[PDB]
Design a protein around this motif. Structure first.
Motif, PDB file in Angstrom:
ATOM      1  N   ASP A 153     -99.406  -1.430  28.400  1.00  8.41           N
ATOM      2  CA  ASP A 153     -98.307  -0.637  27.853  1.00  8.41           C
ATOM      3  C   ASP A 153     -97.330  -0.317  28.977  1.00  8.41           C
ATOM      4  O   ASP A 153     -97.614   0.529  29.830  1.00  8.41           O
ATOM      5  CB  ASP A 153     -98.846   0.643  27.222  1.00  8.41           C
ATOM      6  CG  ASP A 153    -100.053   0.395  26.336  1.00  8.41           C
ATOM      7  OD1 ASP A 153    -100.028  -0.578  25.551  1.00  8.41           O
ATOM      8  OD2 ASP A 153    -101.025   1.175  26.424  1.00  8.41           O
ATOM      9  N   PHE A 154     -96.183  -0.988  28.985  1.00 13.33           N
ATOM     10  CA  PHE A 154     -95.207  -0.841  30.054  1.00 13.33           C
ATOM     11  C   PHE A 154     -93.897  -0.312  29.489  1.00 13.33           C
ATOM     12  O   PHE A 154     -93.439  -0.766  28.434  1.00 13.33           O
ATOM     13  CB  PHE A 154     -94.990  -2.173  30.785  1.00 13.33           C
ATOM     14  CG  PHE A 154     -94.034  -3.103  30.091  1.00 13.33           C
ATOM     15  CD1 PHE A 154     -94.412  -3.787  28.949  1.00 13.33           C
ATOM     16  CD2 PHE A 154     -92.757  -3.299  30.594  1.00 13.33           C
ATOM     17  CE1 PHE A 154     -93.531  -4.644  28.314  1.00 13.33           C
ATOM     18  CE2 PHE A 154     -91.874  -4.154  29.965  1.00 13.33           C
ATOM     19  CZ  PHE A 154     -92.261  -4.827  28.824  1.00 13.33           C
ATOM     20  N   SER A 155     -93.310   0.654  30.186  1.00 13.41           N
ATOM     21  CA  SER A 155     -92.000   1.190  29.837  1.00 13.41           C
ATOM     22  C   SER A 155     -91.167   1.213  31.116  1.00 13.41           C
ATOM     23  O   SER A 155     -91.486   0.552  32.113  1.00 13.41           O
ATOM     24  CB  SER A 155     -92.131   2.572  29.185  1.00 13.41           C
ATOM     25  OG  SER A 155     -92.758   3.491  30.061  1.00 13.41           O
ATOM     26  N   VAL A 156     -90.078   1.984  31.106  1.00 14.76           N
ATOM     27  CA  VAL A 156     -89.240   2.090  32.297  1.00 14.76           C
ATOM     28  C   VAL A 156     -89.979   2.830  33.405  1.00 14.76           C
ATOM     29  O   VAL A 156     -90.032   2.373  34.553  1.00 14.76           O
ATOM     30  CB  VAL A 156     -87.905   2.777  31.958  1.00 14.76           C
ATOM     31  CG1 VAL A 156     -87.099   3.021  33.224  1.00 14.76           C
ATOM     32  CG2 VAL A 156     -87.112   1.936  30.973  1.00 14.76           C
ATOM     33  N   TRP A 157     -90.566   3.983  33.074  1.00 13.47           N
ATOM     34  CA  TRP A 157     -91.272   4.780  34.073  1.00 13.47           C
ATOM     35  C   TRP A 157     -92.459   4.027  34.658  1.00 13.47           C
ATOM     36  O   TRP A 157     -92.783   4.202  35.839  1.00 13.47           O
ATOM     37  CB  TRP A 157     -91.728   6.099  33.452  1.00 13.47           C
ATOM     38  CG  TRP A 157     -92.398   7.036  34.408  1.00 13.47           C
ATOM     39  CD1 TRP A 157     -91.802   8.008  35.156  1.00 13.47           C
ATOM     40  CD2 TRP A 157     -93.798   7.098  34.714  1.00 13.47           C
ATOM     41  NE1 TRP A 157     -92.740   8.669  35.911  1.00 13.47           N
ATOM     42  CE2 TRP A 157     -93.973   8.128  35.658  1.00 13.47           C
ATOM     43  CE3 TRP A 157     -94.918   6.380  34.283  1.00 13.47           C
ATOM     44  CZ2 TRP A 157     -95.222   8.460  36.179  1.00 13.47           C
ATOM     45  CZ3 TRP A 157     -96.157   6.710  34.801  1.00 13.47           C
ATOM     46  CH2 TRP A 157     -96.299   7.741  35.738  1.00 13.47           C
TER      47      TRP A 157
ATOM     48  N   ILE B 158     -92.621   0.657  34.956  1.00 12.62           N
ATOM     49  CA  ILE B 158     -92.084  -0.417  35.790  1.00 12.62           C
ATOM     50  C   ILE B 158     -91.680   0.121  37.158  1.00 12.62           C
ATOM     51  O   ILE B 158     -92.006  -0.464  38.197  1.00 12.62           O
ATOM     52  CB  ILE B 158     -90.902  -1.107  35.083  1.00 12.62           C
ATOM     53  CG1 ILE B 158     -91.403  -2.010  33.953  1.00 12.62           C
ATOM     54  CG2 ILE B 158     -90.072  -1.908  36.077  1.00 12.62           C
ATOM     55  CD1 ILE B 158     -90.292  -2.704  33.193  1.00 12.62           C
ATOM     56  N   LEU B 159     -90.964   1.248  37.178  1.00 14.07           N
ATOM     57  CA  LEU B 159     -90.539   1.837  38.444  1.00 14.07           C
ATOM     58  C   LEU B 159     -91.729   2.235  39.307  1.00 14.07           C
ATOM     59  O   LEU B 159     -91.660   2.150  40.538  1.00 14.07           O
ATOM     60  CB  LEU B 159     -89.644   3.047  38.187  1.00 14.07           C
ATOM     61  CG  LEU B 159     -88.303   2.786  37.500  1.00 14.07           C
ATOM     62  CD1 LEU B 159     -87.542   4.089  37.302  1.00 14.07           C
ATOM     63  CD2 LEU B 159     -87.475   1.796  38.303  1.00 14.07           C
ATOM     64  N   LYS B 160     -92.830   2.657  38.684  1.00 19.67           N
ATOM     65  CA  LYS B 160     -93.988   3.107  39.447  1.00 19.67           C
ATOM     66  C   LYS B 160     -94.775   1.937  40.025  1.00 19.67           C
ATOM     67  O   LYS B 160     -95.222   1.997  41.175  1.00 19.67           O
ATOM     68  CB  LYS B 160     -94.893   3.972  38.571  1.00 19.67           C
ATOM     69  CG  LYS B 160     -96.047   4.623  39.320  1.00 19.67           C
ATOM     70  CD  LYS B 160     -97.248   4.814  38.409  1.00 19.67           C
ATOM     71  CE  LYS B 160     -97.765   3.474  37.912  1.00 19.67           C
ATOM     72  NZ  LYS B 160     -98.943   3.627  37.017  1.00 19.67           N
ATOM     73  N   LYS B 161     -94.956   0.867  39.248  1.00 17.67           N
ATOM     74  CA  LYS B 161     -95.786  -0.252  39.686  1.00 17.67           C
ATOM     75  C   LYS B 161     -95.018  -1.268  40.524  1.00 17.67           C
ATOM     76  O   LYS B 161     -95.543  -1.762  41.528  1.00 17.67           O
ATOM     77  CB  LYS B 161     -96.426  -0.947  38.476  1.00 17.67           C
ATOM     78  CG  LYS B 161     -95.439  -1.626  37.533  1.00 17.67           C
ATOM     79  CD  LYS B 161     -96.140  -2.470  36.483  1.00 17.67           C
ATOM     80  CE  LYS B 161     -95.128  -3.209  35.619  1.00 17.67           C
ATOM     81  NZ  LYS B 161     -95.782  -4.095  34.617  1.00 17.67           N
TER      82      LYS B 161
ATOM     83  N   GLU C 232     -91.899   6.943  41.626  1.00 18.27           N
ATOM     84  CA  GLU C 232     -92.459   7.630  40.469  1.00 18.27           C
ATOM     85  C   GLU C 232     -91.500   8.745  40.081  1.00 18.27           C
ATOM     86  O   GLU C 232     -91.189   9.614  40.903  1.00 18.27           O
ATOM     87  CB  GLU C 232     -93.850   8.194  40.766  1.00 18.27           C
ATOM     88  CG  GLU C 232     -94.427   9.001  39.612  1.00 18.27           C
ATOM     89  CD  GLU C 232     -95.724   9.698  39.967  1.00 18.27           C
ATOM     90  OE1 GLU C 232     -96.309   9.371  41.019  1.00 18.27           O
ATOM     91  OE2 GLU C 232     -96.156  10.579  39.194  1.00 18.27           O
ATOM     92  N   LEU C 233     -91.033   8.719  38.839  1.00 11.00           N
ATOM     93  CA  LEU C 233     -90.025   9.657  38.372  1.00 11.00           C
ATOM     94  C   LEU C 233     -90.664  10.802  37.596  1.00 11.00           C
ATOM     95  O   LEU C 233     -91.692  10.636  36.935  1.00 11.00           O
ATOM     96  CB  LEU C 233     -88.986   8.953  37.496  1.00 11.00           C
ATOM     97  CG  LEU C 233     -87.749   8.391  38.202  1.00 11.00           C
ATOM     98  CD1 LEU C 233     -88.126   7.358  39.255  1.00 11.00           C
ATOM     99  CD2 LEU C 233     -86.784   7.794  37.190  1.00 11.00           C
TER     100      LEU C 233
END
Ligand SMILES: CCCCC/C=C/C/C=C/C/C=C/C/C=C/CCCC(=O)O[C@@H](COC(=O)CCCCCCCCCCCCCCCCC)COP(=O)(O)O[C@@H]1[C@H](O)[C@H](O)[C@H](OP(=O)(O)O)[C@@H](OP(=O)(O)O)[C@H]1O
Ligand SMILES: CCCCC/C=C/C/C=C/C/C=C/C/C=C/CCCC(=O)O[C@@H](COC(=O)CCCCCCCCCCCCCCCCC)COP(=O)(O)O[C@@H]1[C@H](O)[C@H](O)[C@H](OP(=O)(O)O)[C@@H](OP(=O)(O)O)[C@H]1O
Ligand SMILES: CCCCC/C=C/C/C=C/C/C=C/C/C=C/CCCC(=O)O[C@@H](COC(=O)CCCCCCCCCCCCCCCCC)COP(=O)(O)O[C@@H]1[C@H](O)[C@H](O)[C@H](OP(=O)(O)O)[C@@H](OP(=O)(O)O)[C@H]1O
Ligand SMILES: CCCCC/C=C/C/C=C/C/C=C/C/C=C/CCCC(=O)O[C@@H](COC(=O)CCCCCCCCCCCCCCCCC)COP(=O)(O)O[C@@H]1[C@H](O)[C@H](O)[C@H](OP(=O)(O)O)[C@@H](OP(=O)(O)O)[C@H]1O
Lengths: 386, 386, 386, 386
Positions: B15-19, B21-24, B29-30
C-alpha cells in the motif's frame, strides 16, 4: 475616516509561484513535474473505456425486451455496471498518446470495439462499439477531468454516452458519475463514486434518474444507488435501489410505499461479477481486464501501428520492468512533444484518423462521431507514435 | 483463449501513497502538508464575502425601479459586480477559524453586515446583510471548493445567494461562477471566471441567465459575459453583454438583430470602479478592501471577541511581519485542533452563535439562515478562538 | 560449502542516483541544485579573509618586541584572534566569482590589503597584505573545503598562512582550524572551532602548538584553547590557555606546575573586542566588518572593475532587496559559466591578474604568491565579471 | 569616516534553518530525515570490515618470511588489498545497531573473526581476528566518518589498524585511506581512494609509506599507488608502485633510477582477485562477500542473539523484499531509540559485551581492545536488539 493604505508594503513585491519559491528558498530548480509511473496500471485509458463492454449481456438483454420500461431497466443496469469495475482500482490508466487506438473484437460476446485518442490538450478519447448481430450501437467521447485537493483526487469522465438499440429504433444518452480516490496523501487508497445520472430514451420520453450517493457522516451511505424510471409526463413507473459494488434491484411504486435491504416482490436488475482470486495480485483487474492488452496469435497482421497492444511502456510495466517502462514512457512523450513542434512550425493541424468532430444527433452537444470504415483496415497514412 | 494473468507480479505489492513514497524513496518523513502563508493576503474569507457590498448602490438602484424588468437589470449588474474585484487578485484569503465572525456597519452606504464562519470541515461561511432603510435583505452561505490540477487552481463558491427586495416583496436567488487561477506552478498568476449564473425572481418568474465565457483558443473570449433576461414564459425581454472586468451593457432584442463593441441604443448596466494607484502595492486591494480590516476608533467596546479584526495572524501579515504571522497562524490552528479534541472526548457538537441550519425558503436547498439579534451585542457565551 | 549467489536478484538493476530517484519516484525532474541566498551574508569571502586584519595591532605589537619568545606570543594571539569573528556568524559569505578582487587601504591601521579570487573549481582565494611602515608582510591562499553530514557543516580553510616580520628577518607559517556550524537542519545555528594549529618561526626554530578543543561530552570544553611555545629543541618555554571567544593567557612552565580560570602571574596575550550593539541586527558583523563593503567617497576613480564593492548581488542583499539580489546572483553565475564555455571552445586557459602559481619559499607547499604592482593601478586587461 | 550600519535591516530577523524554510516557504513539515534503503547493500558494516580477511594469505605469507623487509612487503600488500573490494561497490553497508556482533570462523583460511558494534553516537565498530595456528593477531576499531558536498561523498575510516605477527614478536599499525563516491547526485556512481598510509613496524623501526593518489586533472593518476619502505634511519630500501584496482609491484632503489608500466626486475607483491561473473548482479560482491551473511547448517546453536546473520532487515533486502526490509529497519531503529530512552531515565550507561575502552599498546591512541573469551560462547546477558 477609512484608511487608504496598509501599514507596511507587501512582504515580497515579486511575481512568485511554486517554481519560484523552490528556486529561491530551497536549492531546487525544477524543469518538469509529471506523473510518476508508480501510480499507473498496465492499462491504457482507451482500454479502460473498453471495460464498459464487460456487461454487454445487459445490452443484449435490453435489446430483446418488448416494452420500453423493461429495456430502461437493463439500460440502467448496464450504465451502473460500467462503473462497478472501479472498486479497489486505485491505479491510474496510462494517458494515451495522440493518435493512439485500441480495437477489441469479441465474437463470443457479439461486439467489435474501436477507440481512438482524438486529442491530447485536453485529453479526449472517442470510442465506438457496434453489435455483431445488427442489434446495438454504443459510442461516445470521454474527457477525464482530474481534480485534486486535500486527501482525495476527483475524476469526472465528462462526455455523452450514447446507446442506440437498433431493433427498437431508439437511443439512450447519459453521463457517468464522478470517481473519487481518497487517502492519496496518507492512508489506504479507496474508491468512491457519486453524482446524478440521467438516462434519456429519445423516442419514448422515458427518463431514468440515478443518484450515486456520497458516503455521508461516518459513511452510512457508501456506494448506495437510488433512483427511479419516469415516463414522458414525469409519472414514476419503477423504483431502483442498491449498491454499485453489489447488486441493483427494482420495484413498482405501489409496493415501495407498502447491507442492502431487499424488499419482497423486487426483481434483480444486475449483480456484480465475482473477481478472480489473483485480482489483488493483478492491479485489481477483472477477468475481462487482463484480456484487453493481450497480443493474440497472428494479431501482428491485422492491427494498425497505433494499437496500444504495441505500446512499449505499458508492455514493460506489464512484464514487471519499471526501469525501461519509465524510460520508454519518457521516450514516447518527448517524441509526442517533438512531433507537436514540427506540426506547429509548418502551421498544420493534427488530423484524426477514425473519428471526426461533430454534434450528437440526439442532444446537440458537441461530440466525436465515428466515421466508419475502420475495420476495412486501410492502415497506411497512420501516425507514427511508438 | 484469453489469458488469465499478467506475466509478472506487481512491482510493489505494498500500500503506497505520497507519504509512503517520500519516506521509502527519499529520506523525508512528513508530518503536515499545509498552505504556506506566502500565498495568502491580509484578508479573512469572511471579509472577502463583504466585498459583495462594494457595489451596494446597484441594490439601492434596483430597489427604486418601478418595474421588474429594470430591477433585474440592476440585480444582474450587482451579481456581476461582486466578482469583478477578483481581477489581478491572486492572493488567497485566510481560511477563517471555526466561530470566526466579521461585522461591517456602513451608515453612508445604507447597510450593516454580519458573517460567521459556521463550519470548518468543510469550510462554510454564512453572511447576512440588511439595508439600514428597510429596503433590502442580502444573505447566503459559501462553501469555497478549491480544486487544483495542471497549471491552474479552480475555486467554486458553492452556495445560494439570496437578495430580498423589501419594498417590492420579491426575492432573487443565484450562484456565483467558478474562479480559476492560472500559472500557479510557473509563469504569471492571472485570474479567470467562467460558468453559468441564473438569477430567479421568485414572485414574477423573471429569470436572468448569464454566461461567464471561458477564454477559448488563444483567449479571444477572455472575461466576456453574455446573457439575457427572460420572462415567466421564456420570452427574452433584454439582451446583456460585456466584460466583468470592464462594463456591462443591455439592449432590447429588436435592436440586437438590427474591446467591447457597444451597440447604439444600448444602456450601461454597470461599470467597474477604477482602482487606487497604490493597489498593486497593496495585494491588489480595492479602496473598499482596505477599510475591511481597519480597527475603528473606540471599536474595542462594541466588537465581539470573535471578529477577525482581532485576529493576530492577519494583523501580523498586514504589518509586514511574516515571521510572527506564520507562527501565530500555526498557534491559532493548533488551538483549533486542540479545541476539537476536547469537544470530541465529551461527545459535544459545536454550537453556531449567530446562524442556524435550515432550508432556503425560496429553493428548498439546505442553507444557513440568520437568527437575528446579533447587533444587540450579547457577547457572552462566545467562543475563545484567538 | 559457501553459497555463491544471493537468493533474489537486485531490487533495481538500474544506475540510480538522487536525480534519478526524484524523477522516477516523485514527479520532480531537477536541473540545478545550488545554495539559496537566504543562508548568505552581505559579504564576499575575499572580504571574509580581510577580517584577519582586524587585530593587526597584534602584528604591530609583535614587530616591536626584542626577543623571539615575546613575538611568538603576539603571533599566536594574532592567529587566534583571526578566527574570533566567527562567533555567532552563521551566514555564509558569497562564493566570489573567478577574477573577483578586493582591496582595503587603512592608513590609520598601517596596512594595505589585496585579495583575488584566483580559481573557481576549486574555489581558491589568494590574499596579500603589507605594512605601510615597512614592518610586516602577510599573505596566503585559502581553499575553503565545505563538508556536511548530520546536523553540522564543517568548513576547513585549507592553505598556508604566512606572516613575515621584516624588521626581524623572520617568517611565521601556520594553518587555521576547522569551523563547524551545528544545527543546520533544525535548532539554533551555532559555531564551533576545533583542530591543531602549529606556528613555525622559520629562522629561530620556535614552534607554537595550539589545540582548539572540540566541546566534549555535554560541552565542557567549549571554545577552550590550550597550547605551548617550544624552542628549537622541543623545550617548552611558555604555556598558553584560554578561549578564542574571550581571552588568551600565557604563563611560564614553572608557575604552571606551581569561565576561564586565570592563574596568578599570567599575562594577557589577547582579549576579544566587544561587538557593537547593532551587531545581531547586522548579520552579527563586527565594527570592522561593516567598513569592508563600503564605497568610499571618490572610490570610483581608483578601484579596478573587479572589486566586490561593485558586485551587485552583495549590494542588493545589503540594501535588503532579496528579489533582485537573487536574480543578480543567478545572472552573474550564468555569465561566469558562459565565459567558461568560450574559454574552452578556444582552448585558452584562464589568466590570473595579480597572483601567480608558485611554491611557498618556507615550506615548499604549493601556494599563490603575490606578483606585486597591484597598486600602480594599471586596470586595463582586467576581466569583465559584473 | 567608516559607516557603522547596513542600509537596511536583515531580510529575516528570525532563526531559520532547513526545517524552518521547508515549513514556512513550502507546505512540508518534516519529522525525520534518514537514509533511504535503496542506497544500501545486503551487508552490515561489521561484515564490511570482515572483507579485510579476504587476502589473509598475505598475512600467512608475511608470517613465513625470515627478514623484516620481505614481511613489510606482504604487510603493505595486505593493507592495500583490504581496500581493493571497494571498486564498483557503491552500495552503503547497513549502519549496525548498538550491540550488534558478527563472527566468522574459517578453518580453511586459518582465522576466526569477531566484531562488535561498540557505539552508535558516533558509530564505532571494533573487530578482532586471530590466526588459528598461533601466527597473527589482527584487530582495530573503525569510526567511518561520512562527509558529503557537491557531487561526491567522502568516507574516512578513522581508527588504528593493528597487525601483530606472533612468530616474529612484532606489530604493525596503520590507517586506511579515504574512500570517495562520485556522482551521487547525477551521473554514474564510481569509487575512488586517496590519502597517505603509514605502516609502522614497532620493533624494527621499519616504516612503509603509501600514497593513494587522487585522480588529477582529467584523471591520469586514477587508482595509482606509489610509496616506499624505509628503515629506522629513513634509508629507502624498497620502491612500491601500482594500482589498488589491479596489482602492486616492488623494486630496489638501484634499479628504480636505472596501464601500469612494470619495470624489469620488479616482483609482484599482490594482484587483485577476479570477480565472479554474477558480481554486477550481486551488488558487486566478491566471492568472499556472499559467504559473509550465510546462515550455516546448524549455526542456530552456536551464534549469539546479536549476530547480524539474524538481522531481519538485511535478510529481507537479501531476499529481495524491500517492502518489509524497509519496515523492519524502521522497526529496529525505533526499538534502538526506545531502548536508549529507558537507559537514560535510569541513568545507566550502555555496556559493551566483548570489547572494552583502552589505549593501543603501540601508539597510545585511544582504541577498543578485545577482552577475549568470546568463543567460549557464554551468550546470556546479551542485548536484545532484534
Ligand atoms: C489529510 C490531507 C492534508 C494534506 C493535504 C495534501 C496536499 C497535497 C500534497 C502535495 C504533495 C507535496 C506538496 C508540495 C506543494 C507545495 C504547495 C503546498 C500547498 C498545500 O499542501 O496543500 C493543501 C491541500 O490542497 C492541495 O492540494 C493544494 C494544491 C496546490 C498545489 C500548488 C498550487 C500553489 C499552492 C497554493 C495555491 C495558491 C492559489 C490559491 C488562490 C485561490 C483564491 C484566489 C493544504 O491543505 P489546506 O490548505 O486545505 O490545508 C489544511 C488546513 O491547514 C486545515 O486547517 C486542516 O486543518 P485541520 O483539519 O487540522 O483542522 C489541514 O488538515 P491536516 O493537514 O492536518 O490533515 C489541511 O488539510
Ligand atoms: C504546466 C504544468 C505542469 C506541471 C503540473 C503541476 C503539478 C503540481 C505540482 C505540485 C508541487 C510538487 C509536486 C509534488 C507531488 C508529487 C506528485 C506528482 C504528481 C504530478 O506532478 O502532477 C501532475 C498535475 O496534476 C496535479 O496536480 C497532480 C496532483 C496530485 C497530488 C498528489 C496525489 C497523488 C499523485 C497522483 C494521484 C494518483 C491517483 C490517480 C487515480 C485516478 C484514476 C483512478 C502531472 O501532470 P500530468 O499528470 O497531467 O502531467 C502532464 C503530462 O505529463 C502531459 O503529458 C504534459 O505533457 P505535454 O503537454 O508535454 O504534452 C505535461 O506537460 P508539462 O509538464 O510539460 O507542462 C504535464 O502537464
Ligand atoms: C539531527 C539531524 C538528522 C537529519 C540529517 C540531515 C540530512 C541532510 C538533510 C538534507 C535536506 C533534505 C535531504 C534530501 C536528500 C535526500 C537524501 C537523504 C539522505 C539522508 O537524509 O541524510 C542523512 C545525513 O547525512 C547527510 O548529510 C547525507 C547527505 C547525502 C546527500 C545525497 C547523497 C546521496 C544519498 C546517500 C549517499 C549514498 C552513498 C553512500 C556510500 C558510502 C559507502 C560506499 C541521514 O542521516 P544518517 O544516515 O546518518 O541517518 C541518521 C540515522 O538514521 C541514525 O540512526 C540516527 O538515529 P538515532 O540517533 O535516532 O539513533 C538519525 O537521527 P535523527 O535523524 O533522529 O536525528 C539520523 O541522524
Ligand atoms: C554537480 C553537483 C551540484 C549539485 C550539488 C548537490 C547538492 C546536494 C543535493 C541534496 C539533495 C537536495 C538538496 C536539498 C537541501 C537544500 C539545501 C540546498 C543546498 C545546496 O544544494 O547544496 C550545494 C552543494 O553542497 C551540499 O552538499 C550542501 C549541503 C547542505 C545541506 C543542508 C545544510 C544547510 C544548507 C546550507 C548550509 C549553510 C551553512 C554554511 C555556513 C558556512 C560558513 C559559516 C550547492 O552547491 P554549491 O553551494 O557549491 O553550489 C554550486 C555553485 O553554485 C557553483 O557556482 C557551481 O557552479 P558552476 O560550476 O556552474 O560554475 C554549481 O555547479 P552545478 O550545480 O551546475 O553543478 C554548484 O555545484
Amino acid at each position: 475616516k477609512h484608511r487608504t493604505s496598509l501599514p507596511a508594503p507587501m512582504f515580497s513585491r515579486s511575481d512568485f509561484s511554486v517554481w519560484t519559491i523552490l528556486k529561491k528558498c530551497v536549492g531546487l530548480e525544477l524543469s518538469k513535474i509529471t506523473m510518476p509511473i508508480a501510480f499507473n496500471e498496465p492499462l491504457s485509458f482507451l482500454q479502460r473505456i473498453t471495460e464498459y463492454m464487460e456487461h454487454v449481456y445487459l445490452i443484449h438483454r435490453a435489446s430483446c425486451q418488448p416494452q420500453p420500461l423493461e429495456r430502461m431497466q437493463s439500460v440502467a443496469a448496464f450504465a451502473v455496471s460500467a462503473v462497478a469495475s472501479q472498486w479497489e482500482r486505485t491505479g491510474k490508466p496510462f494517458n494515451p498518446l495522440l493518435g493512439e487506438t485500441y480495437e477489441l473484437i469479441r465474437e463470443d460476446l457479439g461486439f467489435r470495439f474501436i477507440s481512438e485518442q482524438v486529442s491530447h490538450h485536453p485529453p479526449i478519447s472517442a470510442f465506438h462499439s457496434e453489435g455483431l448481430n445488427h442489434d446495438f450501437l454504443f459510442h461516445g467521447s470521454i474527457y477525464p477531468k482530474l481534480k485534486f485537493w486535500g486527501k482525495s483526487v476527483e475524476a469526472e469522465p465528462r462526455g455523452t454516452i450514447t446507446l442506440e438499440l437498433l431493433k427498437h429504433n431508439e437511443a439512450y444518452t447519459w453521463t457517468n458519475p464522478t470517481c473519487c480516490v481518497h487517502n492519496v496523501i496518507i492512508g489506504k487508497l479507496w474508491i468512491e463514486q457519486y453524482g446524478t445520472v440521467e438516462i434519456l430514451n429519445h423516442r419514448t420520453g422515458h427518463k431514468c434518474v440515478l443518484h450515486f450517493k456520497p458516503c455521508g457522516l461516518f459513511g452510512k451511505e457508501l456506494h448506495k444507488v437510488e433512483g427511479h424510471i419516469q415516463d414522458k409526463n414525469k409519472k414514476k413507473l419503477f423504483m431502483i435501489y442498491g449498491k454499485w459494488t453489489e447488486c441493483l434491484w427494482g420495484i413498482d411504486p405501489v409496493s415501495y410505499e407498502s447491507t442492502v435491504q431487499v424488499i419482497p416482490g423486487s426483481k434483480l436488475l444486475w449483480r456484480i461479477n465475482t473477481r478472480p482470486p489473483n485480482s489483488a495480485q493483478m492491479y485489481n483487474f477483472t477477468s475481462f481486464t487482463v484480456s484487453l492488452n493481450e497480443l493474440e496469435t497472428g494479431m501482428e497482421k491485422t492491427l494498425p501501428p497505433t494499437d496500444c497492444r504495441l505500446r512499449p511502456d505499458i508492455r514493460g510495466m506489464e512484464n514487471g520492468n519499471m526501469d525501461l517502462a519509465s524510460q520508454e514512457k519518457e521516450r514516447l512523450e518527448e517524441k509526442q512533444r517533438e512531433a507537436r513542434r514540427e506540426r506547429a512550425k509548418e502551421e498544420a493541424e493534427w488530423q484524426t484518423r477514425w473519428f471526426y468532430p461533430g454534434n450528437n444527433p440526439y442532444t446537440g452537444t458537441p461530440d466525436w462521431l465515428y466515421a466508419g470504415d475502420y475495420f476495412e483496415r486501410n492502415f497506411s497514412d497512420c501516425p507514427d507514435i511508438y
